[PDB]
Amino acid sequence: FENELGAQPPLGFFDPLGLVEDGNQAKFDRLRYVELKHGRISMLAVVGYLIEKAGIRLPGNISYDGTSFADIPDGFAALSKIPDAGLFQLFAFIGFLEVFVMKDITGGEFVGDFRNGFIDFGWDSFDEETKLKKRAIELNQGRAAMMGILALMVHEKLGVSL
Amino acid sequence: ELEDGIGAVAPLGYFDPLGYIKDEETFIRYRAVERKHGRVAMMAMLGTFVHNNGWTFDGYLSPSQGLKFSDIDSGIGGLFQVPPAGLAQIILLCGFVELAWWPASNLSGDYGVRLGTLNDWEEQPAKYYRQKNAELNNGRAAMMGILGTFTHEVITGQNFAEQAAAGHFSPFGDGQGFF
Amino acid sequence: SEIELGATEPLGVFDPLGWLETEPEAFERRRAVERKHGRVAMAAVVGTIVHNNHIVFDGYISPSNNLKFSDIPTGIDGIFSVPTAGLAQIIAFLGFVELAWLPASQYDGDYGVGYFGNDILDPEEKARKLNAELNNGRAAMMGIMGNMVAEKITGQTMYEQYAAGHFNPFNDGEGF
């Protein structure tokens, strides 16, 4: 596991702990799957935190109930003031994504390739050099975003300005 | 039947420990009795389960004697609570089954009672051996249970609802027997 | 056979620790443990619905102790509120069932009784209900565990919690 997507000009195949010092491909492609699973969530979570800290909201009225978007606080307190009828809808639809439409249904050519032949914004117009660094970008962009988003939440509960 | 091994179930096998089967013709007589006694004593055990639970019919068993269903004892004396004009009806119907409909002279015990898809013995013969052994085994356990139910009322004087209300499940320290 | 059942459509043969390729000699006992843990949890999940719906029998489970059946709590403390002479009668009978009647050293789980008595005549209608026992058994393992940890964390039983409407863990008083 010397030369693939995590191998890296500052730190090539870091691996400090006792994870993959064997030839088990199935151990690696499970761990590679979750690393971009955590990265793709945390990339939207860095942006999803900093639009709430900047105070940007949807144009109002999250419910017919008389609660607007600006009434809902930012950070961990957003979870407590979202109406519970709508907080089921967030967990049910993300569950609807994570069960049904988020998958290697048809078989991609790598791990995390969830194009089932349904949606594709190109991926043919690359020169086979640019494909594997452009998903080495989103591995490392997803790498820094999950240490980014973990910093935003350890310091919200601490109260430290960032 | 001996060759299928109908009564011989897996804890004890061919449990004839005192040596009573000395040929094949006296097994068919004994199995005809054991299966018949087991069928009677199974309905006798479901009786004592229902009687001692207080589940009675509503109304009068004998309105000309004024005897309600509620004032029949749930114990060993409850059958003879019943007027003899009434249980002559029980003996005459049960005697008519024993001679005409399910003739107890039939030593095979088959009377054609088939409840079809719950016993499709022709396509699952293992279900035949399961239901044939369980008719004997539930009949043997209920034969000893009704001998249990009978003598527990005799030696204590209380029926099963009364000796379970008192917690009287030990023949030691009570005023009954020499123990 | 047995090594391909337990593997249904959304994941296939699912073993992230890889003990099928690594230790195949331990699989048929581990299937027997999975099937037994399933069948125990299925009666355990069904029991929690029946207890918390206040379906009780009547009278006293222990008249010496003056302890009714409705005096039993409907949560985790219910089997431990039963007196010790009563719990010893359960475990002695359940050990009679798990060693003599349905001996759990028999690892194919097959004890003479079929599916409602019948042997499944088809081989893959048999494999479909063999997978449905495993999948409902695996779902009930998470169901009884998800009912035990969520009682001891929220402090209330399943009737108590549902009466109170304590369903949202984000706007109550809890951790996070």
Place this chain on the structure above:
Amino acid sequence: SEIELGVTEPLGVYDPLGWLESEPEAFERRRAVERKHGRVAMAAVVGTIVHNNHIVFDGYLSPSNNLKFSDIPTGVDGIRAIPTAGLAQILAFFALVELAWMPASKYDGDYGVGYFGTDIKDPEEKARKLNVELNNGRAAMMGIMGNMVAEVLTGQTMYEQYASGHISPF
């Protein structure tokens, strides 16, 4: 088959008119009448059980006529105390049953239903239950006829003959 279906144990081929050999082809018609007279009379016996046991439908059978389910009698006068618009609904719906649905021309008896949905696969068990329907059908023809002669000579229903103590005619 079919001709060996009314022969159980005691009297066998019991026939004191010789209509065995008198007309052998007019049997498949007469057995179909025997099976339909049995199925009618069997449901009529159990009907007189449940009527005289005072199991009622908890309502009004014709609120325009102002009679409710618990005031028409549980005896012979039951379908005399039914309005003719309701009696026209009974004979028009079973007109759809007796010819359009499972008919009476179909002398096989064998419509599509079988015994509780399913076929009996043993022929000896199937021929056993076929005698049972005939036997219980034949006993209920005597049974339901002896139930309504016994109430038109008495003047009381089944329920009042029993609750009175008026059982034995002597």
Place this chain on the structure above:
Amino acid sequence: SEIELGVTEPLGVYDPLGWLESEPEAFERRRAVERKHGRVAMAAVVGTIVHNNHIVFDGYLSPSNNLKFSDIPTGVDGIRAIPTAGLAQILAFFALVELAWMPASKYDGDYGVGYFGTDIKDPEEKARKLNVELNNGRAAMMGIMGNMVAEVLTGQTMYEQYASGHIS
């Protein structure tokens, strides 16, 4: 096969559009729609019977919105009395039925459950009762398509259509 399975004696094939060999390979889906539309209409018409017989569930549908089970109307607007988390729970669960467990894409109509659990071995036993699943589905399809035009044109629901003398 799947071609014979819907024909009975008083109409036979009965194809006034003639769509049997005019587009014949679109059968295999539009039987699967008729079986689907059948099964959802007979489950909705035996539900309309039990709604108007007042068999309701003893309790509260939503205590947060103060909705008893007797609060809901027993008619066409009874589906609208469901709250917003109520029918979010309906299509979240039945998305796991219609795609995953009982995939409505599967045009066989055969999801391994049989008729009360058994697979009907006799081929004209089971050809008979798939004629029944279609025929009772067809008669239920204008069963409550004639019930909802029977409420929206007189206003009342079935329980007060019958407790009025308003049948004829």
